[model samples]
Target: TITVSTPIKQIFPDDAFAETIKANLKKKSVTDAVTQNELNSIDQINANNSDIKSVQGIQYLPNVRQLNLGGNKLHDISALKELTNLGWLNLSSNKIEKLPQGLFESLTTLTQLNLSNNQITSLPQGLFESLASLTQLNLSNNQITSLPQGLFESLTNLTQLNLSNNQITSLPQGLFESLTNLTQLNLSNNQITSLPQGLFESLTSLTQLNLSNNQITSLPQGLFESLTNLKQLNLSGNQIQSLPQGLHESLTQLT
Candidate 1:
């Protein structure tokens, strides 16, 4: 009288994987079994809808811990407050102009954040204060002209940061005063013309640095003196027509 579907994986004898699209639609409808599982492991989910215009009402599942909203046109994602379990969030390849002030305030568990390839001009000061556990941040390929003086002040636990492909022309003095634990930094492909002499003074623990494809014409002399732990450096593809006589003596990795 009825057609019953058995547990096909165990009974049918094939592989232990099956995800049937029982109902087809223009907008793909993932099963609760799939959505619930991914949302359970992370928060702020932005899956499937790469062309989504606006995440204005992105009501995330309660357990969502990671999000990937890349390749979209969402101008405002202020509605992502429901994703309280967020541990990692990616918003690359979008047209986001300005991030909301209290955005992701509920996602206190976030450890990594990616905002590459957007139109963001700048981040609000102390915008990352609640995220005490953030360890890595990526802000490449944006329109940021300069970082807020104390942008990373609350990120004491951060160890890796990427700020490549932006419009940064200069750095603030003492910018790395609190990034004592940072181990890796990438600042390639920007409009940076010069660096403050004391920019990385307190970054004694830094090991890797990437400064390729920028407008840097010269260093401040002793620029690499404080970076005693540097193991790898990238200075290729810039205006490096010549070198200082003793430039190779300070940074062992440069030679």
Candidate 2:
């Protein structure tokens, strides 16, 4: 049998190991001693703000449904790729600059992902290809310059996305062409120069969109023709030259 506590002992400081183990075990009713099976089904772990910089033993919790590692001092999270059953992940407010390959690829069951407030400059093309069940994603406040085409093509069930406060210069054509179920999207406070034609053609269910505070000089024809369900649109603070002919004709629900 795999001794789960042994690995935990190696990660925590010697002074805090006993206390930490006792507290964590108590939460999940590992009343006496922890075994490998006992470690497998731990429902959730809230280790935020524990001053943890290493994710050494986190891979042991294979059945964790929710994980909150926010506000930690982590820079390398390559240790969490094996948590395939992870549904909700919160990695916000960390110092991670980039993700290891397949970091999120194997987490096929992931529903919500939060990588906001990091230094991510780019993403792997296949990063979100397998996240078909993902619903909510937050990638705000990063240094991303552009998106790879078809990056979000596989996120069909995605409903809410936050990409605000980045250095994105332009979006790839048909980048969001597969997010047909998206409802809300936030792209405020970016350096976008212009939007490609039909960029949002697939987001038919979209209701709220935030393109405010960007460097957009002009919008392409039929840019928002498919967003018949849009309710709120923000296009302020841009260098727009003119609007498309009958642009408001399709936005009957715009408020």
Candidate 3:
């Protein structure tokens, strides 16, 4: 019962609507005759816009693959169930504290999800369970103090995880256990003062790590000793006055 073909200007002012939609429509013709502006709006909106608050309407467009409603004041996104083929969803910088259950249950093909710059305090247990095909996720720059134990347990195929600039003080011991395929991990600018021993144990495939700007004073000897294939490790701007004995010497790359 939702339509995407309505002129964006009708729902909101020309100045308020994403002009990228206007530009894209002016060029290509809409096949569905409804999502003519979806791609354009995604390109024009900032990554921080999540709620799409500027508009006076919201609708479900199941045919859409990529949706960018970042930098909005929306708290309810229950309308996303219709977008079963959605591949990319960004809800950064908004007042959405939690997601509705079954919100992403139908979106199994999603590959990328960005929920940064928001007030999200927690997530559903099976949040990413439906997104088994996802490879990249950004939960950075939010209010998530901690992750649910084994949160990434189902994302065995994940390759990138960003949790930088958050209120996280600790992590579940096996947090990275399932992210064996992760290549990039960003944990910079947080309140993490310590890490579980062998925390980086399963991240053998990781190539880049950002641990700069934290309250860490020391790491367990050989904390990163297991990362034999690591390409980069950044521990700059932390409270660490000294390394964990031979930690620096053990790392193959520290820059």
Candidate 4:
């Protein structure tokens, strides 16, 4: 019989995180080192609730397209900048309170990103400038109080967006001007008291809009004039006593 040769092993400093990856590769023990060829072949990794704290050795897996590290104890995700091929990423239900600048500058192929149920209080401007290919974004259940004017300027292909359950008080004019392709927009459970005019002018493709549980008292004239495709409009839990003129003229699909 021919003799078997030993495969080369790469050591990972973060043994806890490495153990999870080794398990995904069918390796037996944490002491079992992983091979480069095996790491390169992996395009997806489900390490949710794996007690992973540091993703130090994740750079070796350059081809990972989808990664689910949600429901863990993650606080620093700066290591994800190396996985440029990532398309879908979920880091929700973690202890993330902030994000590094340019964290997603190279992740251009990302489509669906979930960062809900985190402790994020603010977002850096231009953080999503490179995510033009993204279609779905979820940022609900955070501590955000305001939004930058050009925050979503580059997300032209975005279709679904969720920003509910935050501490927002008002929206800046032209905030949603670039989101023309957006279909489902949720801004419920916020502290908003008023809306600027022409806020939804460019969102003509919108089908569902939720603005419930706010402090709004009135709506701007022609607010829903361009939203002829709107099918669901929720304005409950607000302080409004009257509706805008010609509101029925545009919302022909409202139910």
lDDT of 3: 0.70
Best by lDDT: 4
lDDT of 1 by residue, 1-255 (tens): 012322322221212111111121122323222333332333334453346555432342466576776776667677676667778888788778888777867778899898888899999887887888999998988989988888888788899999998889888887768888999999998888888887889889999988888898777767778887888777767775454433354254333
Global lDDT of model 2: 0.79
lDDT of 4 by residue, 134-202 (tens): 999999999999999999999999999999999999899899999999999999999999999889999
Give every collision pair in model 3: 48-71, 49-70, 49-71, 50-70, 50-71, 51-72, 93-117
Error of 4 at 32 (Å): 0.9
- Candidate 3 at residue 251, lDDT? 60
Which segments of candidate 1 are over 4 A away from where they belong?
Answer: 1-49, 240-255
Q: What is the C-alpha lDDT of each candidate?
A: 0.69, 0.79, 0.70, 0.85
What C-alpha RMSD separates each model from the true structure? Answer: 8.3, 3.9, 5.1, 4.6
**Strongest candidate by TM-score:** 4
Q: What is the clash tally of candidate 1?
A: 6
The all-Cα superposition gives candidate 4 an RMSD in Å to the true structure of 4.6
Worst 10 residues of 4 by lDDT: 1-10
Residue 209, model 3: lDDT of 90
Name model 3 segments beyond 4 Å from true.
Answer: 1-51, 54-59, 241-255
Better of 1 and 4 by TM-score: 4
Better of 2 and 3 by lDDT: 2
